[PDB]
Amino acid sequence: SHMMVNPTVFFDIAVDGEPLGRVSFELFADKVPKTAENFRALSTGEKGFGYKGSCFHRIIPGFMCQGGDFTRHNGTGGKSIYGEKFEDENFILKHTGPGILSMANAGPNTNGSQFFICTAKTEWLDGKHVVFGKVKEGMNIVEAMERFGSRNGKTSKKITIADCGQLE
């Protein structure tokens, strides 16, 4: 069969509570359905929990912006829609360049809710982080976010997902 149109999610980002702009993502539901569905549902909040009001805890210039720890706000928390953790679905897609959306994890088969947005090609992550989407619009907003990170990931201003959901 021919694929359905892949879903699209938005984040509205704020910096110290001041609006910055919107980033929207294509989710590769065609190729990585279970992992796309988790991120989609966490973005709408439809299971009773999710990304709205969470922070980007770890940002490294030249490398990636990381968020999705909506329970502990520091990289030690988060949960999936399936349970605390779920398996690596597949490694079909690779970390090819800026904009790629991929799962953060704590080793093999430990996906929760944490994710990162690449700002460069990061091929050393191929085969151990599941790639499941890409920025489709607002890569410039990710580049603005990026400036507020540092080599050790600590942010110099508070970067938050003020609002998020699905646009048709």
From Swiss-Prot:
Residues annotated as carrying Phosphoserine in the record are 80
N6-acetyllysine carried by residues? 31, 47, 79, 85, 128, 134, 136
PTM remark: Acetylation at Lys-128 markedly inhibits catalysis of cis to trans isomerization and stabilizes cis rather than trans forms of the HIV-1 capsid. PPIA acetylation also antagonizes the immunosuppressive effects of cyclosporine by inhibiting the sequential steps of cyclosporine binding and calcineurin inhibition. Acetylation at Lys-128 favors its interaction with TARDBP.
Give all residue intervals belonging to the PPIase cyclophilin-type domain. Answer: 10-166
Instruction: Kindly state which keywords UniProt assigns to this record, in alphabetical order.
Output: Acetylation, Apoptosis, Cytoplasm, Glycoprotein, Host-virus interaction, Isomerase, Isopeptide bond, Nucleus, Phosphoprotein, Rotamase, Secreted, Ubl conjugation
- What is one process in the GO biological process aspect for this record? negative regulation of protein kinase activity
Name any one GO molecular function: unfolded protein binding
Tell me the residues linked by Glycyl lysine isopeptide (Lys-Gly) (interchain with G-Cter in SUMO2): 31, 85
Key word Iron-sulfur present in the record? no
Q: What is the effect of changing residue 128 to R?
A: Loss of acetylation and interaction with TARDBP
Phenotype when changing residue 124 to H: No effect on peptidyl-prolyl cis-trans isomerase activity
Regulation of this protein's activity per its record: Binds cyclosporin A (CsA). CsA mediates some of its effects via an inhibitory action on PPIase.
Sites of the Glycyl lysine isopeptide (Lys-Gly) (interchain with G-Cter in ubiquitin) crosslink: 31
Q: Which cysteines are joined by disulfide bonds?
A: none
Query: Where Phosphothreonine occurs along the chain?
Result: 96
Spell out the InterPro entries in the cross-references.
Cyclophilin-like_dom_sf, Cyclophilin-type_PPIase, Cyclophilin-type_PPIase_CS, Cyclophilin-type_PPIase_dom
Q: Which residues are glycosylated?
A: 111
What is the purpose of this protein? Catalyzes the cis-trans isomerization of proline imidic peptide bonds in oligopeptides. Exerts a strong chemotactic effect on leukocytes partly through activation of one of its membrane receptors BSG/CD147, initiating a signaling cascade that culminates in MAPK/ERK activation. Activates endothelial cells (ECs) in a pro-inflammatory manner by stimulating activation of NF-kappa-B and ERK, JNK and p38 MAP-kinases and by inducing expression of adhesion molecules including SELE and VCAM1.
Name the family. Belongs to the cyclophilin-type PPIase family. PPIase A subfamily.
Q: What is this protein called?
A: Peptidyl-prolyl cis-trans isomerase A
- Native organism: Homo sapiens
